[PDB]
């Protein structure tokens, strides 16, 4: 039920891809992920299926057939303290890219040209793990944004999350047209004594 999370007027960026926000409320889903991460302000535009740079190709990679939504709101107190918060690291350069939906917690030194880098730093070897400059005294583009990306997938397994949107109310005793879950017909509706299992 994503209808109550759209008109709340509490998110700075509530966009989707492929599936419309007003259509995924009455549609089943096999499994929904929860990719939560805190980035800067200029990196929000790079979180899109089909982008490149130094963040989407080295940290979080989005699939080409991504049919989900991107939830992002403004914040400066739940992830940035006074004096500068340098607790969120990120990878800037690496020897290879990252496939979509893949995590990496290793720590290696990037190799630029010669001087193979394996446990030794200095010349031709730089530390890729930097740090964001989340400070409340900076501008607007340097403000942190807690982006929560939701992934939608469909497999052959029966989906446990399901349910259509609200419909017209009930009437009884009158001759009426009716439609129950797509069962279109005409008749009189009443209570019944019937002992349905």
């Amino acid at each position, epitope marked *: 039920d994503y209808s109550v999370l759209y008109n709340s007027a509490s998110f700075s960026t509530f966009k989707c891809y492929g599936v419309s926000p007003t259509k995924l409320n009455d549609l089943c889903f096999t499994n929904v992920y929860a990719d939560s991460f805190v980035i800067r302000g200029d990196e929000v535009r790079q979180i899109a299926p089909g982008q490149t740079g130094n963040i989407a190709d080295y940290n979080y990679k989005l699939p080409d057939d991504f049919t989900g939504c991107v939830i992002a709101w403004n914040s400066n107190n739940l992830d940035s303290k006074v004096g500068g918060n340098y607790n969120y690291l990120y990878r800037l350069f690496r020897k290879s890219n990252l496939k979509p939906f893949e995590r990496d917690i290793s720590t290696e030194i990037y190799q630029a040209g*010669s001087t*193979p880098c394996n446990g030794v730093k200095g010349f031709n070897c730089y530390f890729p793990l930097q740090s964001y400059g989340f400070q409340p005294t900076y501008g607007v583009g340097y403000q942190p944004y807690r982006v929560v990306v939701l992934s939608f997938e469909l497999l052959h397994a029966p989906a446990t999350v399901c349910g259509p949107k609200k419909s017209t109310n009930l009437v009884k005793n009158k001759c009426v047209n009716f439609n129950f879950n797509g069962l279109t017909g005409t008749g009189v509706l009443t209570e019944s004594n019937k002992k349905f299992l």
Partner: antibody
Amino acid sequence: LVNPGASLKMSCKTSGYRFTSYIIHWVKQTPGQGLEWIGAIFPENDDTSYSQKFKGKATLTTDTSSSTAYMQLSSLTSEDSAVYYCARDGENVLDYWGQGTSVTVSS
Amino acid sequence: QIVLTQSPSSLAVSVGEKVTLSCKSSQSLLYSNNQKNYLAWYQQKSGRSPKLLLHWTSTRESGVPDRFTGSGSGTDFTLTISSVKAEDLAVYYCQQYYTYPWTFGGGTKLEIK
């Protein structure tokens, strides 16, 4: 033509190849002597690498939009005059080691 | 700051004659982690850009004849040329690839007898 103590800037652009290299190199060779390495440059964070012999006389600046490496030479001397060659370094060589420009130093 | 010593000063080679030139490094240029020797061989024809002939001393350059073959063990590095031609004559140099600062210890003119 640069007088002793003048500042000289040399720029070279790779031709047929678009970036795709993690190092750039500068070499000074006087005629009748072997090539001597000067400095190495990195495309992202500046390498700022200088040889101990050339340290304090050479400055390395790279501009992505320009697509050409920049080398600044200071305190030029008669010994300093030599042919300097723009070069690079990827896996091995990929038409990255370019040609050289002769330097003459006199008042 | 490992200086590299390369000898001899001059190489006299006839056309179609195999020749061996050796460059010696003060410290071993083999990285312990990969157990691979690091060195570069360069050709320097007159009025020409410095050109890499052999890399790592184990891999030939693309579009390079099999006549140029180099084998290096530990400190000693050896490059062997065969079927030498007038176009082939050039100054030959050994460049350390093991660690900064880079040192060009290359140094061998090639002449035809």
